């Protein structure tokens, strides 16, 4: 059971949703988890039960339970938001 | 460069008095010599002037018809002849210098005033 | 017959203070206005000519300005020898010379 | 929200119609015989290029911020908007410089080369809108948006994008507009000082030949000498020719002034009429150059360019202010949730006012310019 962490402070973390994206071998960078400033979790249905994202007070943590070989990839922690003009911040990319 | 007055003093009202404006340095032909009088306790008033280069004598309305200003090139002096002096003409008379128009000497107004002479009626 | 008017008839200031003297002409005389300093019992001395230029051998603290018809004399830092009477003269022409009323600077 | 699609639609229709008219008239009847026409033609072309992609943003805002046009069209539309901003800015700066040169210092190859360079520089300054702008499926939902992407290394990129707009779109260009229009005003001031002073000298010269007494002549020569001295100061922006022209002139007013002082009206009027000979020999060559500079302000192209320049920077003032507030928030200089929400809720409104000038630039031709021949012919 691993656990990934992503720190982003300042402009981010109080107006942009934070979450994780995984670069699967299919090369698509699909959605994994996402938490908003209202603490509304939203995970992909493929990993809905296994993972559990968590927001702190300016770091977001992703909790992993099963860790099947189907989820072995590089995880980018994004940060997306903006009511009218949309901005996306991408993480460095951590391999598991 | 200095202008020195002469001939001032105490004269009776209605008499005739002549003032002098002997100058050293510059030449009278190059400048127009004016006369400014200052009443005791009052300000300056322009009286008369001469342009010895051509001859352009002029007087203020308070002195025109009585005062007469003339210049002598040889003596480098300007003479102011006063006539019909009254109780209003008792003032300190200054002889001033003023250049001719073409150039900066005109823009420099009275700059080398006379030492000042007292005229009392 | 251009008439010169000096509103500040009497000004009182201490050494090192800023004193401003204004002058206005009846007609629109050009920048032909001369400022003079007359100590009591002495002939006037030219300070500012052409309403902006500073006469030779005069301290730079004296400043002359023109705003159309309004002519202004200014002293940046007053001095003990700067207490005298200042006159405003328009010299547009030889026969058209009129001096101001005169302003006295006191301590 | 709901007015942004409607404002965008009306901007699109009005601007495309007006800019098509402007391009047609400038290229057909004006025939690009003036440098200002080449820059105005390029401004109209840039406005058309912007308005081509404008309907995409109208529907994108209309369908609750959903982008069905794809990543390529997202990149292209963002690049077109940024290109419109920068190209319009640069063309206005060059128009102001050209107006300054025409007013103060009375060239198609350099104009066209400058237009090409301006288009290339505006395209290069819109490169971030091409690189960091991709469609983004919001989480696992089907909603797609045309978002601005960043990276971990490019954490200061949002500062760079916001500061580039303020500096290269408002700050530096507004200095050149101020610099050019200040030097235009300085030249127009000394062109009017010489013209107004000579009118006073000329008005009283009619009085001398009309009056029949010494008092009225002397009073007229008094105001002619003061005007001649003032005019000698209004040196046009070779020096001795202007100054010696009035040294002779004031020397003839004095000769007439010392003849009226003797009550010689015949010689006072005769010497006053001798100012005609001095005017033509020395001064008349400068009253034409003062009149030619003074009536170029009356040219309708000057009104059009000034109106376009004035409205463009005034319409972009609200957006550059909120852009500058946004970059301060990103820097953390301003740390308050109340201020941030005001900036976020006003950015879409200011971004619409900023680009409203694309549909008003053609209308400045009808209002300011009186040469709306083809606007009635067509
Ligand atoms: C003509 C305005 C176009 C427009 N309106 C909106 C909204 C908020 C719906 O009103 C949006 C939007 O959703 O971002 N857009 C796209 C856009 C905006 C600014 C810019 C822009 C303007 C000046 C300078 C830079 C940019 C830019 N470049 N890259 N990203 N923004 C480019 C594209
Ligand atoms: C206030 C914001 C919205 C700008 C809108 C006004 C602009 C576009 C226009 C409207 C009226 C215009 C003015 C109308 C008349 C003249 C006189 C002319 O000899 C010089 C230009 C000048 C002075 C114009 C300058 C530009 C102008 C001020």
Residue numbers in the entry:
A (entry chain B): 17 to 73, 76 to 114
B (entry chain C): 5 to 125
C (entry chain D): 2 to 108
D (entry chain A): 28 to 133, 141 to 271, 282 to 341, 1235 to 1315
Quote the authors verbatim.
Here, we sought to develop a more universal approach to identify nanobody ligands for GPCRs. This strategy yielded multiple extracellular surface-targeting nanobodies that allosterically or competitively modulate AT1R signaling. The two nanobodies characterized in this study, AT206 and AT209, share a binding mode with other GPCR nanobody ligands and allosteric modulators, with an extended CDR3 sitting in or above the orthosteric pocket. As the complex is relatively small for cryo-EM, we enhanced the mass of our sample by fusing thermostabilized apocytochrome b562RIL (BRIL) to the third intracellular loop of AT1R.
In our initial experiments with on-cell AT1R, nanobody AT209 did not bind unliganded, AngII-, losartan-, or telmisartan-bound receptor, but bound to olmesartan-bound AT1R with 100 nM affinity. Consistent with its ability to slow olmesartan dissociation, AT209 occludes AT1R’s orthosteric pocket trapping the small-molecule antagonist within the receptor’s core. CDR1 binds adjacent to transmembrane helices 5 and 6, tilting the two helices and ECL 3 outward from the receptor core. CDR3 forms a continuous β-sheet with AT1R’s ECL2, which adopts a β-hairpin fold. AT209’s CDR3 threads down into AT1R’s orthosteric pocket with its β-turn positioned just above olmesartan. In our AT209-AT1R structure, AT209 L103CDR3 sits at the top of this pocket, forming hydrophobic interactions with I2887.39 and olmesartan’s tert-butanol group.
